[PDB]
Amino acid sequence: KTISFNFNQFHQNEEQLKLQRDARISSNSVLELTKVVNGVPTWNSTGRALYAKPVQVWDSTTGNVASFETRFSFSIRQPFPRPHPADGLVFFIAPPNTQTGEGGGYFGIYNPLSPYPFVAVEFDTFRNTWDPQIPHIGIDVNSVISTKTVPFTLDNGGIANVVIKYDASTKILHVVLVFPSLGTIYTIADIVDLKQVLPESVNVGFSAATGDPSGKQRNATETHDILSWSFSASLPG
Amino acid sequence: KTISFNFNQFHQNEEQLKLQRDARISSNSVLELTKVVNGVPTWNSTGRALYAKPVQVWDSTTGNVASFETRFSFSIRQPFPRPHPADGLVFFIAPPNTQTGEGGGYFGIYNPLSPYPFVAVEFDTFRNTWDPQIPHIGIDVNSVISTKTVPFTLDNGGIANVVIKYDASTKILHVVLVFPSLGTIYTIADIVDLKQVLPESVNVGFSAATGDPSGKQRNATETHDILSWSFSASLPG
Ligand SMILES: *[C@@H]1O[C@H](CO)[C@@H](O[C@@H]2O[C@H](CO)[C@@H](O)[C@H](O)[C@H]2NC(C)=O)[C@H](O[C@@H]2O[C@@H](C)[C@@H](O)[C@@H](O)[C@@H]2O)[C@H]1NC(C)=O
Ligand SMILES: *[C@@H]1O[C@H](CO)[C@@H](O[C@@H]2O[C@H](CO)[C@@H](O)[C@H](O)[C@H]2NC(C)=O)[C@H](O[C@@H]2O[C@@H](C)[C@@H](O)[C@@H](O)[C@@H]2O)[C@H]1NC(C)=O
Ligand SMILES: *[C@@H]1O[C@H](CO)[C@@H](O[C@H]2O[C@H](CO)[C@@H](O)[C@H](O)[C@H]2NC(C)=O)[C@H](O[C@@H]2O[C@@H](C)[C@@H](O)[C@@H](O)[C@@H]2O)[C@H]1NC(C)=O
Ligand SMILES: *[C@@H]1O[C@H](CO)[C@@H](O[C@@H]2O[C@H](CO)[C@@H](O)[C@H](O)[C@H]2NC(C)=O)[C@H](O)[C@H]1NC(C)=O
Numbered sequence A, B: 001k002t003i004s005f006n007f008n009q010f011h012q013n014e015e016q017l018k019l020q021r022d023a024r025i026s027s028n029s030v031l032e033l034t035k036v037v038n039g040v041p042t043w044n045s046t047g048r049a050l051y052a053k054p055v056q057v058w059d060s061t062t063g064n065v066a067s068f069e070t071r072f073s074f075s076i077r078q079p080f081p082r083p084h085p086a087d088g089l090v091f092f093i094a095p096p097n098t099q100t101g102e103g104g105g106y107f108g109i110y111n112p113l114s115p116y117p118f119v120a121v122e123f124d125t126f127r128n129t130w131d132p133q134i135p136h137i138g139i140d141v142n143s144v145i146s147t148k149t150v151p152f153t154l155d156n157g158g159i160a161n162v163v164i165k166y167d168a169s170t171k172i173l174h175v176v177l178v179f180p181s182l183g184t185i186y187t188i189a190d191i192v193d194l195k196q197v198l199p200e201s202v203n204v205g206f207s208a209a210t211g212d213p214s215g216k217q218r219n220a221t222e223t224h225d226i227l228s229w230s231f232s233a234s235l236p237g
């Protein structure tokens, strides 16, 4: 059993995507996860985009877990350097039918009063109390307190290429971050047993958030645009 | 204990490098692992380049294993498409003071008569009986029959950027291959316990080979140039 989809770009009312909260598709084909009005990113924004259909990451009858690969390009533009941009974006896998969680440092995937499990790769731009230096790539399992972290320098407004791969046989989740204009390459990997944390069926997608009002800083914002996205998963059985 | 080095370019007769067999440094600063005469790569060639000093990957007193990162750029030019270029190049780790092994599909690191242990990342261009389609990246442990492989499309004559990282805590060896002109990204990873296969001290370097005479094809050749190379290893204790 193999499942896959590709998006060279995004159109309005894409039937394959489920948009939540502030997430919207612009006229020029980009998926804007967080609010941007008249070319300016705003604070107090949270948005998600999930692939409409659920994907099976493992089968309880055979015990087999799926291997998958996903590639996407994103762009984060930070117009206001002072005092600090926030908050970042993530690629995540969660149970089907979840609702947007808390914003700010929780990226819209963590809900304190009704926590659901999730695996996510974050591109964190704001340093919360639980964070190391930013920006950083992080692998998150059921929490925003990453199991592994690696710092990276953002190409402000530039295009970034990401490759996330999961090998079921080794349980290795490895991610690659490339900024073609700068020629920089960042890599991080960790062991994650999907079968142990997630249910057989899940939703895959993105989520992002800008500065929380409690920070009292309107400049704590940035864009979180997804330019393209392909996904492929193989479950033997 | 952190060792580190990097060659942004190669100088004729590098005191830091030990060249073996056909390996030579050209006038324009590139490390040519295999023979190239008058701008043309020849068959029946094998060459290696080892960092002159040994590096300690683990300590038997503490039991600690080192983590390391290495980045290098290479270029493989394939002048003759038919019938099949050969053979490829690898980055390897082996016991100190070893001699060049068999050529062809063994890349000059495997010696059937007197086999020594080794861990290597291959960029295989010729499909031997034990190989999956080519070209492919492969992780080799004591043998050229890779534990893991991933196919890739070569930018003929172009520049390739490689990042190899080993995290001792997870035993994950992950490699990234990027061809900046094509914008393509390839990734592969596997679990390798260095302490279990290699001695405390080792040599790190490259090795490559062109078509073996037994194949009776003079066209089975290509270049195997290394443009730059940095290495870093951190052994706590
Ligand atoms: C919030 O972002 C604003 C846009 O960058 C900041 O204003 C800009 O501040 C620059 C000095 O760092 C100055 O050169 C720009 O002209 C100005 N942009 C405009 C026209 O608004 C703002 O900085 C604060 O407010 C300005 C007016 C000054 O009083 C600064 O000293 C302040 O730091 C940012 N506010 C915060 C909380 O940093
Ligand atoms: C080895 O590579 C050579 C260069 O690519 C091949 O020869 C070239 O073949 C071209 C058509 O495939 C032809 O237009 C070129 O003139 C020729 N280049 C020269 C001057 O050698 C060669 O192909 C075979 O051997 C040559 C000598 C010719 O007889 C071709 O017709 C053959 O296909 C390659 N060797 C083999 C066996 O593939
Ligand atoms: C492939 O490359 C070999 C070098 O590693 C060539 O042989 C040379 O090495 C042998 C032993 O290591 C020496 O005894 C020879 O003197 C070297 N040959 C030369 C050019 O002097 C090898 O050449 C072939 O084998 C040797 C033994 C001779 O019979 C050559 O005439 C013959 O070409 C070369 N193979 C080919 C097919 O070119
Ligand atoms: C931050 O955004 C929330 C909504 O995302 C704001 O609350 C909403 O405010 C509008 C208009 O006042 C109401 O119609 C909604 O029902 C509110 N929803 C919520 C979340 O309660 C909130 O006021 C914003 N904070 C600030 C200070 O701008």
Ligand SMILES: CO[C@@H]1[C@@H](O)[C@@H](O)[C@@H](CO)O[C@@H]1O
Pocket: A086, A087, A103, A104, A105, A106, A126, A128, A210, A211, A212, A213, A214, A215, A216, A217, A220
């Ligand atoms: C969860 O805490 C928030 C951070 O993640 C940022 O959004 C910051 C921006 O000012 O505001 C809050 O401190």
Ligand SMILES: CO[C@@H]1[C@@H](O)[C@@H](O)[C@@H](CO)O[C@@H]1O
Pocket: B086, B087, B104, B105, B106, B126, B128, B210, B211, B212, B213, B214, B215, B216, B217, B220
């Ligand atoms: C070990 O086998 C050899 C290959 O690795 C290539 O060198 C090929 C080139 O023609 O010749 C032999 O089949």
Ligand SMILES: [Ca+2]
Pocket: A087, A105, A124, A125, A126, A127, A128, A131
């Ligand atoms: Ca954060």
Ligand SMILES: [Ca+2]
Pocket: B087, B105, B124, B125, B126, B127, B128, B131
């Ligand atoms: Ca081969």
Ligand SMILES: [Mn+2]
Pocket: A122, A124, A131, A132, A136, A138, A144, A146
């Ligand atoms: Mn973080």
Ligand SMILES: [Mn+2]
Pocket: B122, B124, B131, B132, B136, B138, B144, B146
């Ligand atoms: Mn191979």
